[PDB]
Protein backbone atom coordinates (compact mmCIF):
# COMPACT_ATOMS: atom_id res chain seq x y z
CA UNK A 1 0.00 0.00 0.00
CA UNK A 2 1.39 3.35 1.11
CA UNK A 3 5.06 3.75 1.89
CA UNK A 4 5.56 2.91 5.57
CA UNK A 5 9.05 3.08 7.12
CA UNK A 6 12.31 1.14 7.32
CA UNK A 7 12.87 -1.69 9.76
CA UNK A 8 15.95 -1.85 11.98
CA UNK A 9 18.20 -4.86 11.85
CA UNK A 10 16.67 -7.69 13.88
CA UNK A 11 19.24 -9.99 15.52
CA UNK A 12 18.42 -13.66 16.02
CA UNK A 13 18.62 -14.86 19.63
CA UNK A 14 19.46 -18.59 19.89
CA UNK A 15 16.94 -20.78 21.67
CA UNK A 16 13.24 -20.40 22.29
CA UNK A 17 10.95 -19.63 25.20
CA UNK A 18 7.25 -20.27 25.81
CA UNK A 19 4.58 -19.46 23.27
CA UNK A 20 2.88 -16.11 23.77
CA UNK A 21 -0.19 -15.98 26.01
CA UNK A 22 -2.24 -12.80 25.67
CA UNK A 23 -5.23 -11.33 27.41
CA UNK A 24 -8.22 -11.26 25.05
CA UNK A 25 -10.55 -8.30 25.51
CA UNK A 26 -13.44 -10.34 24.09
CA UNK A 27 -13.23 -13.31 26.48
CA UNK A 28 -11.79 -11.08 29.27
CA UNK A 29 -9.11 -13.65 30.07
CA UNK A 30 -5.57 -14.61 29.12
CA UNK A 31 -5.57 -17.20 26.34
CA UNK A 32 -2.75 -18.76 24.31
CA UNK A 33 -1.90 -17.11 21.01
CA UNK A 34 -1.64 -19.99 18.52
CA UNK A 35 -0.84 -18.79 15.00
CA UNK A 36 -0.15 -20.80 11.90
CA UNK A 37 3.33 -20.62 10.36
CA UNK A 38 2.40 -17.04 9.38
CA UNK A 39 1.02 -15.07 12.33
CA UNK A 40 -1.45 -12.35 11.35
CA UNK A 41 -2.01 -8.96 12.98
CA UNK A 42 -4.19 -5.96 12.14
CA UNK A 43 -3.64 -2.90 14.34
CA UNK A 44 -5.81 0.17 13.87
CA UNK A 45 -3.55 2.98 12.71
CA UNK A 46 -3.58 6.68 13.42
CA UNK A 47 -5.96 9.33 12.39
CA UNK A 48 -3.19 11.64 11.06
CA UNK A 49 -3.13 14.62 13.40
CA UNK A 50 -1.22 15.18 16.64
CA UNK A 51 1.92 13.51 15.25
CA UNK A 52 3.05 10.59 17.41
CA UNK A 53 1.88 11.27 20.93
CA UNK A 54 2.73 8.90 23.75
CA UNK A 55 -0.70 7.29 23.50
CA UNK A 56 0.18 6.40 19.91
CA UNK A 57 3.64 5.21 20.97
CA UNK A 58 2.28 3.08 23.81
CA UNK A 59 -0.13 1.37 21.41
CA UNK A 60 2.27 0.62 18.56
CA UNK A 61 5.17 -0.33 20.84
CA UNK A 62 2.94 -2.92 22.55
CA UNK A 63 2.25 -4.53 19.20
CA UNK A 64 5.93 -4.23 18.32
CA UNK A 65 6.65 -6.56 21.27
CA UNK A 66 4.15 -9.08 19.89
CA UNK A 67 5.69 -8.76 16.42
CA UNK A 68 9.19 -9.24 17.86
CA UNK A 69 8.17 -12.15 20.07
CA UNK A 70 6.51 -13.92 17.12
CA UNK A 71 9.69 -13.48 15.07
CA UNK A 72 11.74 -14.79 18.01
CA UNK A 73 9.54 -17.91 18.00
CA UNK A 74 10.18 -18.53 14.29
CA UNK A 75 6.88 -17.29 12.86
CA UNK A 76 6.54 -15.33 9.67
CA UNK A 77 4.41 -12.25 10.47
CA UNK A 78 1.81 -10.40 8.34
CA UNK A 79 1.32 -6.98 10.00
CA UNK A 80 -1.38 -4.79 8.47
CA UNK A 81 -2.07 -1.26 9.67
CA UNK A 82 -4.27 1.50 8.28
CA UNK A 83 -4.31 5.27 8.27
CA UNK A 84 -7.73 6.87 8.78
CA UNK A 85 -6.84 9.67 6.39
CA UNK A 86 -10.47 10.71 5.85
CA UNK A 87 -12.24 11.22 9.15
CA UNK A 88 -14.55 13.64 10.91
CA UNK A 89 -12.04 14.52 13.70
CA UNK A 90 -9.44 15.07 10.97
CA UNK A 91 -11.76 17.47 9.13
CA UNK A 92 -12.42 19.34 12.37
CA UNK A 93 -8.71 19.72 13.16
CA UNK A 94 -7.90 20.85 9.61
CA UNK A 95 -10.61 23.52 9.78
CA UNK A 96 -9.38 24.66 13.21
CA UNK A 97 -5.78 24.74 11.99
CA UNK A 98 -6.66 26.61 8.80
CA UNK A 99 -5.05 23.85 6.74
CA UNK A 100 -6.21 21.41 4.08
CA UNK A 101 -7.13 18.01 5.48
CA UNK A 102 -4.89 16.23 2.98
CA UNK A 103 -1.95 18.57 3.61
CA UNK A 104 -2.45 17.96 7.34
CA UNK A 105 -2.88 14.21 6.95
CA UNK A 106 0.11 13.81 4.64
CA UNK A 107 2.34 15.86 6.94
CA UNK A 108 1.29 14.00 10.11
CA UNK A 109 1.57 10.57 8.47
CA UNK A 110 5.15 11.53 7.58
CA UNK A 111 5.86 12.58 11.18
CA UNK A 112 4.50 9.18 12.23
CA UNK A 113 6.89 7.38 9.87
CA UNK A 114 9.81 9.31 11.33
CA UNK A 115 8.83 8.67 14.94
CA UNK A 116 8.23 4.97 14.26
CA UNK A 117 11.66 4.62 12.66
CA UNK A 118 13.31 6.54 15.50
CA UNK A 119 11.61 4.22 18.00
CA UNK A 120 12.83 1.22 15.94
CA UNK A 121 9.29 -0.13 15.52
CA UNK A 122 8.99 -2.93 12.98
CA UNK A 123 6.88 -1.61 10.09
CA UNK A 124 3.68 -3.20 8.80
CA UNK A 125 3.91 -5.25 5.63
CA UNK A 126 0.83 -3.49 4.22
CA UNK A 127 0.13 0.14 5.15
CA UNK A 128 -3.31 1.08 3.85
CA UNK A 129 -4.92 4.52 3.73
CA UNK A 130 -8.69 4.53 4.17
CA UNK A 131 -9.07 6.53 0.93
CA UNK A 132 -7.29 3.74 -0.97
CA UNK A 133 -9.71 1.16 0.48
CA UNK A 134 -12.95 2.66 -0.90
CA UNK A 135 -13.40 -0.09 -3.49
CA UNK A 136 -13.09 -2.81 -0.85
CA UNK A 137 -15.53 -0.95 1.40
CA UNK A 138 -17.93 -0.71 -1.55
CA UNK A 139 -17.57 -4.40 -2.42
CA UNK A 140 -18.37 -5.36 1.17
CA UNK A 141 -21.32 -2.99 1.62
CA UNK A 142 -22.71 -4.50 -1.60
CA UNK A 143 -22.53 -7.90 0.08
CA UNK A 144 -24.14 -6.58 3.27
CA UNK A 145 -27.05 -5.07 1.31
CA UNK A 146 -27.56 -8.28 -0.69
CA UNK A 147 -28.08 -10.29 2.51
CA UNK A 148 -30.22 -7.74 4.35
CA UNK A 149 -27.59 -7.07 7.01
CA UNK A 150 -27.51 -3.52 5.61
CA UNK A 151 -30.28 -1.20 4.42
CA UNK A 152 -30.60 2.23 2.82
CA UNK A 153 -32.34 4.68 5.14
CA UNK A 154 -35.58 6.22 3.83
CA UNK A 155 -34.12 9.69 3.23
CA UNK A 156 -34.34 10.99 -0.33
CA UNK A 157 -31.86 13.81 0.24
CA UNK A 158 -29.38 11.79 2.34
CA UNK A 159 -29.79 8.05 1.64
CA UNK A 160 -27.22 6.77 4.13
CA UNK A 161 -26.50 3.03 4.30
CA UNK A 162 -26.64 1.39 7.72
CA UNK A 163 -25.55 -1.93 9.19
CA UNK A 164 -28.14 -3.71 11.33
CA UNK A 165 -26.80 -4.14 14.85
CA UNK A 166 -28.70 -7.47 14.96
CA UNK A 167 -27.18 -8.70 11.69
CA UNK A 168 -25.09 -11.09 13.80
CA UNK A 169 -26.58 -12.98 16.74
CA UNK A 170 -23.26 -12.62 18.56
CA UNK A 171 -23.14 -8.81 18.30
CA UNK A 172 -21.73 -7.56 21.59
CA UNK A 173 -19.43 -10.51 22.36
CA UNK A 174 -16.26 -8.48 21.95
CA UNK A 175 -17.04 -5.66 24.40
CA UNK A 176 -19.61 -7.44 26.57
CA UNK A 177 -21.37 -4.09 26.99
CA UNK A 178 -25.12 -3.91 27.49
CA UNK A 179 -27.45 -1.68 25.48
CA UNK A 180 -27.43 1.33 27.83
CA UNK A 181 -23.63 1.40 27.94
CA UNK A 182 -23.45 1.04 24.15
CA UNK A 183 -25.86 3.96 23.63
CA UNK A 184 -23.72 6.25 25.79
CA UNK A 185 -20.44 5.25 24.13
CA UNK A 186 -21.98 5.13 20.64
CA UNK A 187 -23.11 8.75 20.97
CA UNK A 188 -19.85 9.99 22.47
CA UNK A 189 -17.53 8.12 20.05
CA UNK A 190 -18.88 9.08 16.62
CA UNK A 191 -22.20 7.23 16.40
CA UNK A 192 -25.55 8.78 15.48
CA UNK A 193 -28.16 7.09 17.69
CA UNK A 194 -30.84 9.73 17.05
CA UNK A 195 -30.64 9.77 13.25
CA UNK A 196 -34.23 9.51 11.95
CA UNK A 197 -35.23 6.40 10.01
CA UNK A 198 -32.80 3.90 11.53
CA UNK A 199 -34.28 0.56 12.55
CA UNK A 200 -32.15 0.40 15.72
CA UNK A 201 -30.44 3.31 17.48
CA UNK A 202 -27.30 1.15 17.44
CA UNK A 203 -27.30 0.62 13.66
CA UNK A 204 -23.92 1.73 12.34
CA UNK A 205 -23.22 3.99 9.38
CA UNK A 206 -21.72 2.03 6.47
CA UNK A 207 -21.90 4.65 3.70
CA UNK A 208 -22.56 8.33 4.37
CA UNK A 209 -24.48 9.95 1.51
CA UNK A 210 -22.94 12.97 -0.23
CA UNK A 211 -23.15 16.19 1.77
CA UNK A 212 -22.28 19.74 0.69
CA UNK A 213 -18.71 20.63 1.56
CA UNK A 214 -17.65 17.02 2.12
CA UNK A 215 -15.45 14.74 0.00
CA UNK A 216 -17.32 11.98 -1.80
CA UNK A 217 -16.65 8.91 -3.95
CA UNK A 218 -18.89 7.07 -6.44
CA UNK A 219 -20.67 3.85 -5.53
CA UNK A 220 -23.66 1.71 -6.58
CA UNK A 221 -25.53 3.11 -3.54
CA UNK A 222 -24.90 6.72 -4.54
CA UNK A 223 -22.10 9.19 -4.03
CA UNK A 224 -20.69 9.35 -0.51
CA UNK A 225 -17.92 8.17 1.81
CA UNK A 226 -17.32 5.14 4.06
CA UNK A 227 -18.31 4.72 7.64
CA UNK A 228 -15.39 4.37 10.02
CA UNK A 229 -15.78 0.77 11.22
CA UNK A 230 -16.28 -0.78 7.78
CA UNK A 231 -13.00 0.82 6.62
CA UNK A 232 -10.93 -1.31 9.00
CA UNK A 233 -13.21 -4.32 8.60
CA UNK A 234 -12.69 -4.31 4.83
CA UNK A 235 -8.93 -3.69 4.98
CA UNK A 236 -8.40 -6.46 7.53
CA UNK A 237 -10.66 -8.92 5.73
CA UNK A 238 -9.25 -8.34 2.24
CA UNK A 239 -5.58 -8.33 3.34
CA UNK A 240 -5.50 -11.11 5.94
CA UNK A 241 -8.71 -13.10 5.52
CA UNK A 242 -10.60 -14.97 8.21
CA UNK A 243 -7.50 -16.33 9.95
CA UNK A 244 -6.85 -13.09 11.85
CA UNK A 245 -4.87 -13.89 14.99
CA UNK A 246 -4.90 -10.39 16.52
CA UNK A 247 -7.09 -7.32 16.13
CA UNK A 248 -5.44 -4.47 18.02
CA UNK A 249 -5.68 -0.78 18.75
CA UNK A 250 -6.21 1.90 21.34
CA UNK A 251 -8.31 1.41 24.45
CA UNK A 252 -11.38 3.34 23.25
CA UNK A 253 -11.73 1.05 20.20
CA UNK A 254 -13.29 -1.80 22.23
CA UNK A 255 -16.65 -0.17 21.50
CA UNK A 256 -17.98 0.91 19.10
CA UNK A 257 -15.13 0.44 16.69
CA UNK A 258 -13.95 -3.16 17.05
CA UNK A 259 -17.43 -4.44 17.91
CA UNK A 260 -18.86 -3.26 14.57
CA UNK A 261 -15.77 -4.03 12.47
CA UNK A 262 -15.92 -7.62 13.75
CA UNK A 263 -19.69 -7.77 13.19
CA UNK A 264 -19.38 -6.44 9.62
CA UNK A 265 -16.78 -9.09 8.74
CA UNK A 266 -18.52 -11.97 10.51
CA UNK A 267 -21.75 -11.08 8.72
CA UNK A 268 -20.21 -11.09 5.22
CA UNK A 269 -18.12 -14.23 5.84
CA UNK A 270 -20.53 -16.29 7.94
CA UNK A 271 -17.68 -16.91 10.40
CA UNK A 272 -18.37 -16.78 14.12
CA UNK A 273 -15.27 -14.82 15.16
CA UNK A 274 -13.40 -12.21 13.14
CA UNK A 275 -10.19 -12.25 15.22
CA UNK A 276 -8.94 -14.77 17.76
CA UNK A 277 -7.59 -12.06 20.10
CA UNK A 278 -8.73 -8.47 20.62
CA UNK A 279 -5.91 -6.43 22.17
CA UNK A 280 -6.36 -2.91 23.53
CA UNK A 281 -3.85 -0.50 25.05
CA UNK A 282 -2.85 3.14 25.07
CA UNK A 283 -1.89 5.88 27.47
CA UNK A 284 -3.63 8.87 28.98
CA UNK A 285 -2.09 12.30 29.38
CA UNK A 286 -1.38 14.05 32.65
CA UNK A 287 -5.07 14.93 33.16
CA UNK A 288 -6.41 11.39 32.77
CA UNK A 289 -7.70 12.08 29.24
CA UNK A 290 -6.47 10.90 25.87
CA UNK A 291 -3.71 13.15 24.59
CA UNK A 292 -4.86 15.99 22.34
CA UNK A 293 -3.51 19.38 21.31
CA UNK A 294 -6.75 21.07 22.31
CA UNK A 295 -6.46 19.69 25.88
CA UNK A 296 -2.89 20.91 26.45
CA UNK A 297 -1.91 17.40 27.60
CA UNK A 298 -0.13 16.43 24.38
CA UNK A 299 3.38 14.95 24.68
CA UNK A 300 4.95 14.15 21.30
CA UNK A 301 7.79 11.72 20.62
CA UNK A 302 9.45 14.42 18.49
CA UNK A 303 9.29 16.78 21.49
CA UNK A 304 11.13 14.26 23.66
CA UNK A 305 13.71 13.67 20.91
CA UNK A 306 14.24 17.42 20.52
CA UNK A 307 14.87 17.56 24.29
CA UNK A 308 17.66 15.00 23.87
CA UNK A 309 15.70 11.96 25.05
CA UNK A 310 16.99 8.66 23.70
CA UNK A 311 14.20 6.79 21.85
CA UNK A 312 15.24 3.68 23.79
CA UNK A 313 14.46 5.59 26.98
CA UNK A 314 10.97 6.28 25.62
CA UNK A 315 10.49 2.54 25.05
CA UNK A 316 11.82 1.70 28.52
CA UNK A 317 9.66 4.38 30.13
CA UNK A 318 6.55 3.06 28.40
CA UNK A 319 7.59 -0.51 29.27
CA UNK A 320 7.93 0.30 32.98
CA UNK A 321 4.19 -0.35 33.22
CA UNK A 322 2.08 -3.24 31.99
CA UNK A 323 -0.04 -2.45 28.94
CA UNK A 324 -3.30 -3.33 30.73
CA UNK A 325 -2.49 -1.08 33.69
CA UNK A 326 -3.18 2.67 33.70
CA UNK A 327 0.14 3.97 32.39
CA UNK A 328 1.11 7.60 32.89
CA UNK A 329 4.14 9.56 31.73
CA UNK A 330 5.99 11.94 34.05
CA UNK A 331 9.43 13.36 34.80
CA UNK A 332 9.88 10.58 37.36
CA UNK A 333 9.07 7.98 34.69
CA UNK A 334 11.52 9.60 32.24
CA UNK A 335 14.20 9.75 34.94
CA UNK A 336 13.92 6.06 35.88
CA UNK A 337 13.98 5.15 32.18
CA UNK A 338 17.12 7.25 31.64
CA UNK A 339 18.75 5.70 34.71
CA UNK A 340 17.71 2.20 33.63
CA UNK A 341 19.07 2.76 30.11
CA UNK A 342 22.41 3.98 31.49
CA UNK A 343 22.60 1.08 33.94
CA UNK A 344 21.90 -1.49 31.21
CA UNK A 345 24.43 0.15 28.89
CA UNK A 346 27.02 -0.03 31.69
CA UNK A 347 26.58 -3.77 32.23
CA UNK A 348 26.53 -4.61 28.52
CA UNK A 349 29.76 -2.61 28.11
CA UNK A 350 31.57 -4.76 30.68
CA UNK A 351 34.51 -6.87 29.43
CA UNK A 352 32.90 -9.98 30.94
CA UNK A 353 29.79 -10.78 32.92
CA UNK A 354 27.95 -13.69 34.54
CA UNK A 355 26.21 -16.26 32.37
CA UNK A 356 23.13 -14.76 30.71
CA UNK A 357 21.24 -18.00 30.06
CA UNK A 358 18.82 -17.65 32.98
CA UNK A 359 18.00 -13.97 32.50
CA UNK A 360 17.33 -14.44 28.78
CA UNK A 361 15.05 -17.38 29.56
CA UNK A 362 13.31 -15.32 32.24
CA UNK A 363 12.84 -12.36 29.90
CA UNK A 364 11.28 -14.71 27.34
CA UNK A 365 8.97 -16.22 29.98
CA UNK A 366 7.83 -12.83 31.27
CA UNK A 367 7.17 -11.42 27.79
CA UNK A 368 5.26 -14.59 26.89
CA UNK A 369 3.06 -14.09 29.98
CA UNK A 370 0.80 -11.36 28.59
CA UNK A 371 3.76 -9.07 27.82
CA UNK A 372 4.97 -8.69 31.41
CA UNK A 373 7.53 -5.99 30.62
CA UNK A 374 7.78 -4.76 34.27
CA UNK A 375 9.05 -8.17 35.38
CA UNK A 376 11.24 -8.58 32.28
CA UNK A 377 12.77 -5.17 33.01
CA UNK A 378 13.26 -6.18 36.66
CA UNK A 379 15.02 -9.40 35.64
CA UNK A 380 17.38 -7.39 33.44
CA UNK A 381 17.94 -4.91 36.29
CA UNK A 382 18.94 -7.86 38.49
CA UNK A 383 21.40 -9.34 36.00
CA UNK A 384 22.87 -5.89 35.45
CA UNK A 385 23.28 -5.22 39.17
CA UNK A 386 24.94 -8.61 39.70
CA UNK A 387 27.34 -8.01 36.80
CA UNK A 388 28.28 -4.52 38.01
CA UNK A 389 28.55 -5.37 41.72
CA UNK A 390 30.22 -8.79 41.57
CA UNK A 391 31.33 -9.39 37.97
CA UNK A 392 31.61 -12.57 35.98
CA UNK A 393 33.82 -14.29 33.45
CA UNK A 394 31.78 -14.77 30.26
CA UNK A 395 33.17 -12.46 27.56
CA UNK A 396 30.06 -13.02 25.39
CA UNK A 397 27.21 -12.39 27.83
CA UNK A 398 27.42 -8.55 27.73
CA UNK A 399 26.89 -8.56 23.96
CA UNK A 400 24.40 -11.43 24.19
CA UNK A 401 22.25 -9.48 26.66
CA UNK A 402 22.47 -6.39 24.44
CA UNK A 403 21.35 -8.35 21.36
CA UNK A 404 18.43 -9.94 23.23
CA UNK A 405 17.26 -6.57 24.55
CA UNK A 406 17.53 -5.36 20.94
CA UNK A 407 15.67 -8.29 19.37
CA UNK A 408 12.92 -8.65 21.98
CA UNK A 409 12.45 -5.14 23.41
CA UNK A 410 13.67 -3.00 20.50
CA UNK A 411 15.98 -1.19 22.92
CA UNK A 412 19.37 -0.22 21.44
CA UNK A 413 22.12 -0.42 24.08
Ligand SMILES: COc1ccc(-c2cccc(S(=O)(=O)NC(=O)[C@@H](N)CS)c2)cn1
Nearest residue numbers: 044045046047055059084250251282283290
Ligand atom coordinates in the same frame (compact mmCIF):
# COMPACT_ATOMS: atom_id res chain seq x y z
C1 LIG B 1 -7.11 5.79 26.15
O1 LIG B 1 -5.89 6.34 25.66
C2 LIG B 1 -5.64 6.20 24.34
C3 LIG B 1 -6.72 6.35 23.47
C4 LIG B 1 -6.46 6.25 22.12
C5 LIG B 1 -5.17 6.01 21.66
C6 LIG B 1 -4.87 5.89 20.21
C7 LIG B 1 -3.97 4.93 19.74
C8 LIG B 1 -3.73 4.77 18.39
C9 LIG B 1 -4.38 5.58 17.47
C10 LIG B 1 -5.25 6.56 17.92
S1 LIG B 1 -5.98 7.68 16.78
O2 LIG B 1 -6.99 8.43 17.47
O3 LIG B 1 -4.92 8.37 16.11
N1 LIG B 1 -6.65 6.74 15.61
C11 LIG B 1 -7.71 5.90 15.77
O4 LIG B 1 -8.21 5.61 16.85
C12 LIG B 1 -8.26 5.35 14.46
N2 LIG B 1 -7.49 5.86 13.32
C13 LIG B 1 -8.33 3.83 14.48
S2 LIG B 1 -8.80 3.11 12.88
C14 LIG B 1 -5.51 6.71 19.28
C15 LIG B 1 -4.18 5.87 22.63
N3 LIG B 1 -4.40 5.96 23.95
Ligand SMILES: [Ca+2]
Nearest residue numbers: 013072073074
Ligand atom coordinates in the same frame (compact mmCIF):
# COMPACT_ATOMS: atom_id res chain seq x y z
CA1 LIG C 1 14.86 -17.54 17.14
Ligand SMILES: [Ca+2]
Nearest residue numbers: 352392393394
Ligand atom coordinates in the same frame (compact mmCIF):
# COMPACT_ATOMS: atom_id res chain seq x y z
CA1 LIG D 1 37.80 -12.77 34.59
Ligand SMILES: [Zn+2]
Nearest residue numbers: 044045232257
Ligand atom coordinates in the same frame (compact mmCIF):
# COMPACT_ATOMS: atom_id res chain seq x y z
ZN1 LIG E 1 -9.64 0.92 12.96
